[PDB]
Amino acid sequence: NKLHVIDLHKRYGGHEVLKGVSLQARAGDVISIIGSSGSGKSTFLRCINFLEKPSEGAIIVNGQNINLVRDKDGQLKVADKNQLRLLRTRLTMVFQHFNLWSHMTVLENVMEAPIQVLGLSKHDARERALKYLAKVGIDERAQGKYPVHLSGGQQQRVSIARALAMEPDVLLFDEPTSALDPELVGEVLRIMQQLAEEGKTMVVVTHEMGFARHVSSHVIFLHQGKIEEEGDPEQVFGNPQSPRLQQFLKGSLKKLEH
Amino acid sequence: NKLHVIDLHKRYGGHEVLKGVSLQARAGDVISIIGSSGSGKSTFLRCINFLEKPSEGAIIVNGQNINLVRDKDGQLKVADKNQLRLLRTRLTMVFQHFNLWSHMTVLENVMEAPIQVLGLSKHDARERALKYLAKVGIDERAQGKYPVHLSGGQQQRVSIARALAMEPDVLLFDEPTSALDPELVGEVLRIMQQLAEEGKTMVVVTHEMGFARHVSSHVIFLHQGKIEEEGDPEQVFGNPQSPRLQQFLKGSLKKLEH
Ligand SMILES: Nc1ncnc2c1ncn2[C@@H]1O[C@H](COP(=O)(O)OP(=O)(O)OP(=O)(O)O)[C@@H](O)[C@H]1O
Ligand SMILES: Nc1ncnc2c1ncn2[C@@H]1O[C@H](COP(=O)(O)OP(=O)(O)OP(=O)(O)O)[C@@H](O)[C@H]1O
Ligand SMILES: [Cl-]
Ligand SMILES: [Cl-]
Ligand SMILES: [Cl-]
Ligand SMILES: [Cl-]
Ligand SMILES: [Cl-]
Ligand SMILES: [Cl-]
């Protein structure tokens, strides 16, 4: 379907972090990945778009394999540059940090990649940027401001609009609400829920079990670099089988994120 | 001064390994012990804190003798338990292996002995743990992770922070970089150099002659259980007298540690 990640491993030097994980997202799937800090969730997402290099595995986007070749360092690299670019355009990522260009206004930040990477006219890029900024609740008065002027919550909403304006096949999110004021978490989770309700294909790493249970079509529990349990949210959360998953669900209640 | 080890011998059963070695560390001394694998370096360090039992010798800490008595097995044991404990608190050790509690987070691992052994309040132990974890470059994001989540290099940095948090009189290190990825060795040697520059009293066994020559105030060449040559690093390395030391320095270049 849209994304198929097969038998992915990843090492940093000699330290193996991901030990064989797979994921398959079909159109409209909303996959939440949960697990302890250190289980390798961020490494998993960063390998999907090659921000990090896998040591083993395959990545297929829209049914087309992304050719990989073993590099100098013994890791896997994307053979063809266009497959890497094509890639970063069909999959977009929203991170814990906001990742906006400090010298560009909110509007310019959302217009930039559609122009520079997709080759769109300024008019077409502006129309997408206005559409998606409205969707995330960033109004005209805020559009001429710069990142330094905005709260973390506002910057993350702008980052979500930036990802949406690329009109990708899959949206990847790595704990997007983790650095936000706790009072602002709900609002961002609701924007992500609205995208899911509109049929977007999404992969989300999160500590907010409310979103993982309530919005996901599939939940993956990552444990020490492997998928220890996965399935429908009602099963994973309501009828956990693995003692490791049961312990994670109990312990997570007391951790303060925030 | 801080530690005086006198005429130490050690046998495993009938096999005599250490055959009369002495060491004296005054405040701020940085003593590196070098020699072939099998010369008895680890046995020497493990006797200092009684992880191994000497067959002959005396150990004096801060000018106070640790009373020893000949045991059932014919080896020497520390007579008084408090002298043994007091001991393990004034001297701390960092090993080739990391020695962290698998069920405790990084932060909990560094706080544990100051609470349990020293009797500190949780607050005082946490303040020491945050201080020393920062010193070894382990940030907040890594502090809530468990040993299984970390590379060897990270685990060793945490182990160094654990030793430092006891605020001991002498830090003992047995080849702390030997099991680390070669790319990570330098960084750990630099942390050890920073401790030396801050005036810490240290005894270090190592195959990294760069540290032994560049950072030590005194170098001991151990050969078949005895000190064959010792002195200032510029003399031991730049003007070796013993043909055994000369042969060790030449042969060591080709050994691969990795
Ligand atoms: N840049 C890096 N260099 C070396 N090792 C890294 C790096 N980033 C991550 N790691 C290793 O991968 C494991 C960590 O990260 P990941 O970032 O995959 O964790 P998570 O499970 O997503 O946790 P969190 O996001 O809470 O840190 C770490 O514990 C560390 O050993
Ligand atoms: N647990 C043990 N039981 C019996 N003999 C031991 C034990 N540990 C060490 N020895 C003896 O002491 C000599 C070894 O160790 P030591 O561990 O002192 O060596 P080193 O010189 O520190 O070398 P390396 O660390 O490279 O092994 C060995 O060759 C062995 O004969
Ligand atoms: Cl301003
Ligand atoms: Cl915020
Ligand atoms: Cl989140
Ligand atoms: Cl885990
Ligand atoms: Cl390592
Ligand atoms: Cl070393």
Coordinates of C-alpha atoms and ligand atoms in Angstrom, one line a residue:
Chain A
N1 CA 0.0 0.0 0.0
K2 CA 1.6 3.3 1.1
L3 CA 4.6 2.3 3.1
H4 CA 6.2 -1.0 3.9
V5 CA 9.2 -1.2 6.2
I6 CA 10.8 -4.6 6.3
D7 CA 13.1 -6.3 8.8
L8 CA 14.7 -3.0 9.8
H9 CA 17.8 -3.0 12.0
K10 CA 20.0 0.0 13.0
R11 CA 23.3 0.3 14.8
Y12 CA 25.1 3.4 16.0
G13 CA 28.7 2.2 15.6
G14 CA 28.7 -1.2 17.4
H15 CA 25.6 -0.5 19.4
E16 CA 22.6 -2.3 17.8
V17 CA 19.4 -0.4 18.7
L18 CA 16.8 -1.7 16.3
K19 CA 16.8 -5.5 16.0
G20 CA 14.4 -6.4 13.2
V21 CA 11.2 -4.3 13.0
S22 CA 8.5 -4.1 10.3
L23 CA 5.6 -1.8 9.6
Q24 CA 3.0 -1.6 6.8
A25 CA 0.7 1.3 6.4
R26 CA -2.2 1.2 3.9
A27 CA -4.2 4.2 3.0
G28 CA -5.9 5.6 6.0
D29 CA -4.0 3.6 8.6
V30 CA -3.1 5.5 11.8
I31 CA -0.3 3.6 13.5
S32 CA 0.8 4.6 17.0
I33 CA 4.2 3.4 18.3
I34 CA 4.5 3.2 22.1
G35 CA 7.2 2.0 24.4
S36 CA 9.8 3.0 27.0
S37 CA 12.3 5.8 26.3
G38 CA 15.3 4.0 24.9
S39 CA 13.2 1.3 23.1
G40 CA 14.3 2.9 19.8
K41 CA 11.2 4.7 18.7
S42 CA 12.9 7.7 17.3
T43 CA 15.5 5.6 15.6
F44 CA 12.7 3.6 13.9
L45 CA 11.1 6.8 12.5
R46 CA 14.4 8.4 11.5
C47 CA 15.3 5.3 9.5
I48 CA 12.0 5.4 7.6
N49 CA 13.1 8.7 5.9
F50 CA 16.8 8.0 6.1
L51 CA 17.6 10.7 8.6
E52 CA 19.4 7.7 10.1
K53 CA 20.9 4.9 8.1
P54 CA 19.5 1.3 8.7
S55 CA 22.0 -1.5 9.0
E56 CA 19.5 -4.0 7.6
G57 CA 16.1 -3.9 5.9
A58 CA 14.0 -2.5 3.0
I59 CA 11.7 0.4 2.5
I60 CA 8.9 0.4 -0.1
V61 CA 6.9 3.5 -0.8
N62 CA 3.6 3.2 -2.8
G63 CA 4.6 -0.3 -3.8
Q64 CA 8.0 0.9 -5.3
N65 CA 11.2 -0.4 -3.6
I66 CA 13.7 2.3 -2.6
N67 CA 17.0 0.7 -3.7
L68 CA 19.6 0.3 -1.0
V69 CA 23.3 -0.5 -1.2
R70 CA 25.8 -1.2 1.6
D71 CA 28.0 1.9 2.1
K72 CA 31.6 2.5 3.3
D73 CA 30.6 2.4 6.9
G74 CA 28.8 -0.9 6.6
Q75 CA 25.4 0.8 6.8
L76 CA 22.7 1.0 4.1
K77 CA 22.4 4.1 1.9
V78 CA 19.8 5.0 -0.7
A79 CA 21.5 4.3 -4.0
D80 CA 19.7 6.9 -6.1
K81 CA 19.4 10.6 -5.0
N82 CA 16.0 11.0 -6.7
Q83 CA 14.7 8.1 -4.8
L84 CA 15.9 9.8 -1.6
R85 CA 14.3 13.1 -2.6
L86 CA 11.1 11.6 -4.0
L87 CA 11.1 9.9 -0.7
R88 CA 11.3 13.0 1.6
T89 CA 8.4 14.4 -0.5
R90 CA 6.0 11.3 -0.1
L91 CA 6.7 11.0 3.6
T92 CA 7.0 14.1 5.8
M93 CA 8.0 14.3 9.4
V94 CA 6.9 16.4 12.4
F95 CA 9.4 16.2 15.3
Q96 CA 9.8 16.9 19.0
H97 CA 11.6 20.1 18.0
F98 CA 9.9 22.5 15.6
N99 CA 12.3 22.7 12.8
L100 CA 11.4 26.1 11.2
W101 CA 13.7 28.4 9.4
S102 CA 14.4 31.2 11.8
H103 CA 14.8 33.9 9.1
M104 CA 11.4 33.1 7.4
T105 CA 7.9 34.2 8.5
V106 CA 5.3 31.6 9.3
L107 CA 3.8 31.9 5.8
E108 CA 7.2 31.8 4.1
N109 CA 8.1 28.7 6.1
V110 CA 5.0 26.8 4.9
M111 CA 5.5 27.9 1.3
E112 CA 9.2 27.1 1.1
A113 CA 9.5 23.4 0.3
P114 CA 6.5 23.3 -2.1
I115 CA 8.4 26.0 -4.1
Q116 CA 11.9 24.8 -3.7
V117 CA 11.5 21.0 -3.6
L118 CA 8.2 20.5 -5.6
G119 CA 8.8 23.4 -8.1
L120 CA 5.4 25.0 -7.6
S121 CA 4.6 28.5 -8.6
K122 CA 4.5 31.0 -5.7
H123 CA 0.8 31.3 -6.1
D124 CA 0.1 27.6 -5.9
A125 CA 2.4 27.3 -2.9
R126 CA 0.8 30.2 -1.1
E127 CA -2.7 28.8 -1.7
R128 CA -1.6 25.5 -0.1
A129 CA 0.1 27.3 2.8
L130 CA -3.0 29.4 3.5
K131 CA -5.2 26.3 3.4
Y132 CA -3.1 24.3 5.8
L133 CA -2.3 27.2 8.2
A134 CA -6.1 27.7 8.6
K135 CA -6.5 24.0 9.2
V136 CA -4.1 24.1 12.2
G137 CA -5.6 27.4 13.5
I138 CA -2.8 29.9 12.7
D139 CA -4.5 33.0 11.5
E140 CA -3.4 35.9 9.4
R141 CA -2.1 38.0 12.3
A142 CA 0.4 35.3 13.1
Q143 CA 1.5 34.6 9.5
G144 CA 3.8 37.5 9.2
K145 CA 5.5 36.7 12.5
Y146 CA 8.8 34.7 12.8
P147 CA 9.4 31.4 14.8
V148 CA 11.2 33.4 17.6
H149 CA 7.9 35.2 18.3
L150 CA 5.8 32.1 18.8
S151 CA 5.1 29.6 21.6
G152 CA 6.2 26.0 21.2
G153 CA 2.5 25.1 20.5
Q154 CA 2.3 27.7 17.7
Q155 CA 5.6 26.6 16.2
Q156 CA 4.4 22.9 16.2
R157 CA 1.1 23.9 14.6
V158 CA 3.1 25.7 11.9
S159 CA 5.3 22.6 11.5
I160 CA 2.3 20.4 11.0
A161 CA 1.0 22.9 8.3
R162 CA 4.5 22.7 6.7
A163 CA 4.2 18.9 6.5
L164 CA 0.7 19.0 5.2
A165 CA 1.5 21.5 2.5
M166 CA 3.8 19.0 0.8
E167 CA 0.6 16.9 0.4
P168 CA 2.5 13.7 1.2
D169 CA 1.3 10.1 1.2
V170 CA 2.3 9.5 4.8
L171 CA 2.7 11.8 7.8
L172 CA 5.2 10.7 10.5
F173 CA 5.1 12.3 13.9
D174 CA 7.7 11.8 16.7
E175 CA 6.2 12.9 20.1
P176 CA 4.9 16.2 18.7
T177 CA 3.4 17.3 22.0
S178 CA 6.3 16.3 24.2
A179 CA 7.9 19.7 24.5
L180 CA 4.7 21.7 24.6
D181 CA 3.1 23.2 27.7
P182 CA 0.9 20.5 29.2
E183 CA -2.2 22.8 28.8
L184 CA -1.6 22.8 25.0
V185 CA -1.3 19.1 24.4
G186 CA -5.0 18.3 24.0
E187 CA -5.4 20.9 21.2
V188 CA -2.6 19.4 19.1
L189 CA -3.8 15.8 19.7
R190 CA -7.2 17.0 18.4
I191 CA -5.6 18.4 15.2
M192 CA -3.9 15.0 14.7
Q193 CA -7.3 13.3 15.3
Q194 CA -9.0 15.5 12.7
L195 CA -6.3 14.5 10.2
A196 CA -7.0 10.8 11.0
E197 CA -10.7 11.4 10.6
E198 CA -10.1 12.9 7.2
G199 CA -8.4 9.7 6.1
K200 CA -4.7 10.7 6.3
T201 CA -2.1 7.9 6.6
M202 CA -0.1 8.5 9.8
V203 CA 2.6 7.0 12.0
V204 CA 2.8 8.5 15.4
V205 CA 5.2 8.0 18.3
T206 CA 3.6 9.2 21.5
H207 CA 3.5 9.0 25.3
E208 CA -0.2 10.2 25.2
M209 CA -2.0 6.9 25.6
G210 CA -5.3 8.7 25.1
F211 CA -4.4 9.3 21.4
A212 CA -2.8 5.9 21.0
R213 CA -5.9 4.1 22.1
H214 CA -8.6 6.5 20.9
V215 CA -7.4 7.4 17.4
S216 CA -5.1 4.6 16.1
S217 CA -6.2 1.8 13.7
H218 CA -3.0 -0.2 14.8
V219 CA -0.7 0.0 17.9
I220 CA 2.9 -1.2 18.0
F221 CA 4.5 -1.7 21.4
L222 CA 8.3 -1.4 20.9
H223 CA 10.6 -3.1 23.5
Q224 CA 14.3 -3.1 23.4
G225 CA 14.5 -2.6 19.6
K226 CA 11.8 -5.2 18.6
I227 CA 8.0 -5.2 18.3
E228 CA 6.9 -7.1 21.4
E229 CA 3.2 -6.8 20.8
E230 CA 1.0 -5.1 18.2
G231 CA -2.6 -5.1 17.0
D232 CA -5.9 -3.2 17.3
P233 CA -5.8 -0.6 20.1
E234 CA -8.6 -2.3 22.0
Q235 CA -6.6 -5.5 22.1
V236 CA -3.2 -3.9 22.9
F237 CA -4.6 -1.7 25.6
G238 CA -7.7 -3.6 26.8
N239 CA -6.3 -7.2 26.6
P240 CA -2.5 -7.0 26.7
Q241 CA -0.9 -10.4 26.4
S242 CA 2.8 -9.8 27.0
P243 CA 4.0 -9.4 30.6
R244 CA 6.4 -6.7 29.2
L245 CA 3.4 -4.8 27.7
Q246 CA 1.4 -5.1 30.9
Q247 CA 4.4 -3.8 32.9
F248 CA 4.9 -0.9 30.5
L249 CA 1.2 0.1 30.7
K250 CA 1.3 0.1 34.5
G251 CA 4.6 1.9 34.9
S252 CA 3.8 4.5 32.3
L253 CA 1.0 5.9 34.4
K254 CA 3.5 7.3 36.9
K255 CA 6.0 8.8 34.6
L256 CA 5.8 12.5 34.2
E257 CA 6.4 13.8 30.7
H258 CA 5.7 17.5 31.5
Chain B
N1 CA 49.0 10.0 51.9
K2 CA 45.8 8.6 50.3
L3 CA 46.6 5.0 49.6
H4 CA 49.7 2.8 50.4
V5 CA 49.8 -0.8 49.2
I6 CA 52.7 -2.7 50.6
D7 CA 54.4 -5.9 49.5
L8 CA 51.3 -7.4 48.0
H9 CA 51.2 -11.0 46.9
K10 CA 48.2 -12.9 45.6
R11 CA 47.7 -16.6 44.7
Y12 CA 44.7 -18.3 43.1
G13 CA 45.0 -21.7 44.8
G14 CA 48.6 -22.7 44.3
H15 CA 49.2 -20.3 41.4
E16 CA 51.1 -17.2 42.6
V17 CA 50.2 -14.3 40.4
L18 CA 51.4 -11.2 42.2
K19 CA 54.8 -11.5 43.7
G20 CA 55.4 -8.5 45.9
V21 CA 54.2 -5.2 44.5
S22 CA 53.8 -1.8 46.2
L23 CA 52.1 1.5 45.3
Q24 CA 51.7 4.8 47.0
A25 CA 49.3 7.5 45.9
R26 CA 49.4 10.9 47.4
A27 CA 46.7 13.5 46.7
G28 CA 46.6 14.3 43.0
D29 CA 48.8 11.5 41.9
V30 CA 47.7 9.8 38.6
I31 CA 49.3 6.4 38.4
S32 CA 49.1 4.3 35.2
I33 CA 49.9 0.6 35.3
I34 CA 51.0 -1.0 32.0
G35 CA 52.1 -4.4 31.1
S36 CA 51.4 -7.5 29.1
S37 CA 48.0 -9.3 29.5
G38 CA 48.7 -11.9 32.2
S39 CA 51.2 -9.7 34.2
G40 CA 48.6 -9.5 36.9
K41 CA 47.2 -5.9 36.5
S42 CA 43.6 -6.7 37.2
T43 CA 44.6 -8.9 40.2
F44 CA 46.6 -5.9 41.5
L45 CA 43.6 -3.6 41.3
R46 CA 41.1 -6.1 42.7
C47 CA 43.3 -6.8 45.7
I48 CA 43.3 -3.0 46.5
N49 CA 39.6 -3.1 47.3
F50 CA 39.5 -6.7 48.3
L51 CA 37.4 -8.0 45.4
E52 CA 40.3 -10.5 45.5
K53 CA 42.1 -11.6 48.6
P54 CA 45.9 -11.0 48.9
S55 CA 48.1 -13.7 50.2
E56 CA 50.6 -11.2 51.6
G57 CA 50.7 -7.5 52.2
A58 CA 49.1 -4.4 53.8
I59 CA 46.7 -1.7 52.7
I60 CA 46.7 1.7 54.3
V61 CA 44.0 4.3 53.4
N62 CA 44.4 7.9 54.4
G63 CA 47.2 6.9 56.7
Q64 CA 45.0 4.3 58.6
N65 CA 45.9 0.7 58.3
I66 CA 43.2 -1.7 57.2
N67 CA 43.7 -4.6 59.7
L68 CA 44.2 -8.0 58.0
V69 CA 44.1 -11.5 59.4
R70 CA 45.0 -14.8 57.9
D71 CA 41.8 -16.8 57.0
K72 CA 40.7 -20.4 56.7
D73 CA 42.0 -20.7 53.1
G74 CA 45.4 -19.2 54.0
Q75 CA 44.6 -15.9 52.4
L76 CA 44.3 -12.5 54.0
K77 CA 40.9 -11.1 54.9
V78 CA 39.8 -7.7 56.3
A79 CA 39.2 -8.3 60.0
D80 CA 36.6 -5.6 60.5
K81 CA 33.5 -5.2 58.3
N82 CA 33.4 -1.5 58.7
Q83 CA 36.9 -1.2 57.6
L84 CA 35.9 -3.2 54.5
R85 CA 32.9 -1.0 53.9
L86 CA 34.6 2.3 54.8
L87 CA 37.1 1.0 52.3
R88 CA 34.7 0.5 49.3
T89 CA 33.6 4.1 50.0
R90 CA 37.0 5.8 50.0
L91 CA 38.2 3.9 46.9
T92 CA 35.8 3.3 44.0
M93 CA 36.4 1.2 40.9
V94 CA 35.5 1.5 37.2
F95 CA 35.9 -1.8 35.3
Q96 CA 36.2 -3.2 31.8
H97 CA 32.5 -4.3 32.2
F98 CA 30.0 -1.6 33.2
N99 CA 28.4 -2.9 36.3
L100 CA 25.1 -1.1 36.4
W101 CA 21.9 -2.4 37.9
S102 CA 19.8 -3.5 35.0
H103 CA 16.5 -2.7 36.7
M104 CA 17.4 0.9 37.5
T105 CA 17.5 4.0 35.3
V106 CA 20.7 5.8 34.6
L107 CA 19.8 8.4 37.3
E108 CA 18.7 5.8 39.8
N109 CA 22.0 3.9 39.3
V110 CA 24.1 7.0 40.2
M111 CA 21.9 7.8 43.2
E112 CA 21.8 4.3 44.6
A113 CA 25.0 3.8 46.6
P114 CA 25.1 7.4 48.0
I115 CA 21.7 6.7 49.5
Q116 CA 22.1 3.0 50.5
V117 CA 25.8 3.0 51.5
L118 CA 26.4 6.6 52.5
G119 CA 23.0 7.2 54.0
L120 CA 22.3 10.4 52.1
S121 CA 18.9 11.9 51.7
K122 CA 17.3 11.4 48.3
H123 CA 17.7 15.1 47.5
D124 CA 21.5 15.2 48.3
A125 CA 22.1 12.0 46.3
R126 CA 20.1 13.3 43.3
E127 CA 22.1 16.6 43.4
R128 CA 25.4 14.6 43.3
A129 CA 24.1 12.3 40.5
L130 CA 23.0 15.3 38.3
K131 CA 26.3 17.0 38.9
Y132 CA 28.4 14.0 37.9
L133 CA 26.2 12.8 35.0
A134 CA 26.6 16.3 33.5
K135 CA 30.4 16.0 34.0
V136 CA 30.5 12.8 31.9
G137 CA 28.1 14.2 29.3
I138 CA 25.0 12.1 29.9
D139 CA 22.0 14.5 29.5
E140 CA 18.5 14.6 30.8
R141 CA 17.1 12.6 27.9
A142 CA 19.4 9.7 28.7
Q143 CA 18.8 9.8 32.5
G144 CA 15.5 8.0 32.4
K145 CA 16.8 5.2 30.2
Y146 CA 18.0 1.8 31.5
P147 CA 21.4 0.2 30.9
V148 CA 20.0 -2.1 28.2
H149 CA 19.2 0.9 26.1
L150 CA 22.7 2.4 26.0
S151 CA 25.9 1.8 24.2
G152 CA 29.0 0.5 26.0
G153 CA 30.5 4.0 25.9
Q154 CA 27.3 5.5 27.5
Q155 CA 27.2 2.8 30.1
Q156 CA 30.9 3.4 31.0
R157 CA 30.3 7.2 31.3
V158 CA 27.4 6.4 33.7
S159 CA 29.7 4.0 35.6
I160 CA 32.3 6.8 35.9
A161 CA 29.5 9.1 37.2
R162 CA 28.5 6.4 39.7
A163 CA 32.1 6.2 41.0
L164 CA 32.4 10.0 41.2
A165 CA 29.1 10.4 43.1
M166 CA 30.6 8.5 46.0
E167 CA 33.1 11.3 46.3
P168 CA 35.9 8.9 47.1
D169 CA 39.5 9.6 47.9
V170 CA 40.9 7.5 45.1
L171 CA 39.4 6.4 41.7
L172 CA 40.6 3.0 40.4
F173 CA 40.1 2.2 36.7
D174 CA 40.8 -1.2 35.0
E175 CA 41.0 -0.7 31.2
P176 CA 37.8 1.3 31.1
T177 CA 38.0 1.8 27.3
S178 CA 38.9 -1.7 26.4
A179 CA 35.4 -2.9 25.5
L180 CA 34.3 0.3 23.8
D181 CA 34.0 1.0 20.1
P182 CA 37.5 2.2 19.1
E183 CA 35.9 5.5 17.8
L184 CA 34.7 6.2 21.4
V185 CA 38.0 5.6 23.2
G186 CA 39.3 9.1 22.9
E187 CA 36.3 10.8 24.5
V188 CA 36.5 8.6 27.6
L189 CA 40.3 9.1 27.9
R190 CA 39.6 12.9 27.8
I191 CA 37.0 12.6 30.6
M192 CA 39.7 10.8 32.6
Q193 CA 42.2 13.5 31.7
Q194 CA 39.8 16.2 32.9
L195 CA 39.5 14.4 36.3
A196 CA 43.3 14.4 36.5
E197 CA 43.4 18.1 35.7
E198 CA 41.0 18.8 38.5
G199 CA 43.3 17.1 41.0
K200 CA 41.7 13.7 41.4
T201 CA 43.8 10.8 42.7
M202 CA 43.6 8.0 40.3
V203 CA 45.1 4.5 39.5
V204 CA 44.5 3.5 35.9
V205 CA 45.4 0.2 34.1
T206 CA 45.4 0.8 30.4
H207 CA 46.6 -0.3 27.0
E208 CA 46.3 3.3 25.7
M209 CA 49.9 4.5 25.9
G210 CA 48.8 8.0 24.9
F211 CA 46.9 8.3 28.3
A212 CA 49.7 6.5 30.2
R213 CA 52.4 8.9 28.9
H214 CA 50.4 12.1 28.6
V215 CA 48.3 12.2 31.7
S216 CA 50.2 10.2 34.4
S217 CA 52.3 11.6 37.2
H218 CA 53.8 8.1 37.7
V219 CA 53.9 4.9 35.5
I220 CA 54.3 1.3 36.7
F221 CA 55.4 -1.4 34.3
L222 CA 54.2 -4.7 35.7
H223 CA 56.0 -7.9 34.5
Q224 CA 55.2 -11.4 35.6
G225 CA 53.6 -10.2 38.9
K226 CA 56.4 -7.7 39.9
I227 CA 57.1 -4.0 39.2
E228 CA 60.0 -4.3 36.7
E229 CA 60.3 -0.5 36.1
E230 CA 58.5 2.6 37.3
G231 CA 58.9 6.3 37.4
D232 CA 58.0 9.6 35.7
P233 CA 56.2 8.9 32.3
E234 CA 58.9 10.7 30.4
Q235 CA 61.5 8.4 31.8
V236 CA 59.6 5.1 31.5
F237 CA 58.5 5.9 28.0
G238 CA 61.3 8.1 26.7
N239 CA 64.3 6.5 28.4
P240 CA 63.3 2.9 29.3
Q241 CA 66.1 1.1 31.1
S242 CA 64.9 -2.5 31.4
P243 CA 65.2 -4.7 28.3
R244 CA 61.8 -6.2 29.3
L245 CA 60.2 -2.7 29.3
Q246 CA 61.9 -2.0 25.9
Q247 CA 60.5 -5.2 24.5
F248 CA 57.0 -4.5 25.9
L249 CA 56.9 -1.0 24.4
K250 CA 58.0 -2.4 21.0
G251 CA 55.7 -5.3 20.9
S252 CA 52.7 -3.5 22.2
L253 CA 52.5 -1.3 19.0
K254 CA 51.4 -4.3 17.0
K255 CA 48.8 -5.7 19.4
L256 CA 45.3 -5.0 18.5
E257 CA 43.0 -4.3 21.3
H258 CA 39.9 -3.4 19.2
Ligands
LIG1 N1 23.0 10.3 17.6 C1 23.2 9.1 18.3 N2 24.5 8.7 18.5 C2 24.7 7.5 19.2 N3 23.8 6.7 19.7 C3 22.5 7.3 19.5 C4 22.1 8.4 18.9 N4 20.8 8.6 18.9 C5 20.3 7.6 19.6 N5 21.3 6.7 20.0 C6 21.2 5.4 20.7 O1 19.9 4.9 20.4 C7 19.2 4.7 21.6 C8 18.3 5.9 21.5 O2 17.3 6.4 20.9 P1 16.0 6.6 20.4 O3 16.5 8.0 20.1 O4 15.9 5.6 19.3 O5 15.2 6.4 21.7 P2 13.6 6.5 22.0 O6 13.4 5.1 22.3 O7 13.1 7.1 20.8 O8 13.8 7.4 23.3 P3 13.7 9.0 23.5 O9 13.1 9.7 22.3 O10 12.9 9.1 24.7 O11 15.2 9.3 23.7 C9 19.9 5.5 22.7 O12 19.7 5.0 24.0 C10 21.3 5.6 22.2 O13 22.0 4.5 22.8
LIG2 N1 39.2 -16.1 38.8 C1 40.4 -16.6 38.6 N2 40.6 -17.9 39.0 C2 41.8 -18.4 38.8 N3 42.9 -17.8 38.3 C3 42.6 -16.5 37.9 C4 41.4 -15.8 38.0 N4 41.5 -14.5 37.6 C5 42.8 -14.5 37.2 N5 43.5 -15.6 37.4 C6 44.9 -15.9 37.2 O1 45.6 -14.7 37.2 C7 46.3 -14.4 36.0 C8 45.4 -13.4 35.5 O2 44.9 -12.2 35.6 P1 44.8 -10.8 35.6 O3 43.4 -11.0 35.6 O4 45.5 -10.5 36.9 O5 45.5 -10.5 34.3 P2 45.9 -9.0 33.5 O6 47.3 -9.2 33.7 O7 45.1 -8.1 34.3 O8 45.3 -9.6 32.1 P3 43.9 -9.4 31.4 O9 43.1 -8.3 32.1 O10 44.3 -9.0 30.0 O11 43.4 -10.8 31.5 C9 45.7 -15.3 34.9 O12 46.6 -15.6 33.8 C10 45.2 -16.5 35.7 O13 46.2 -17.5 35.8
CL3 CL 11.3 41.3 16.9
CL4 CL 4.2 25.4 24.2
CL5 CL 2.8 13.4 21.3
CL6 CL 12.4 -1.0 26.2
CL7 CL 30.8 1.3 22.9
CL8 CL 41.6 2.1 29.0

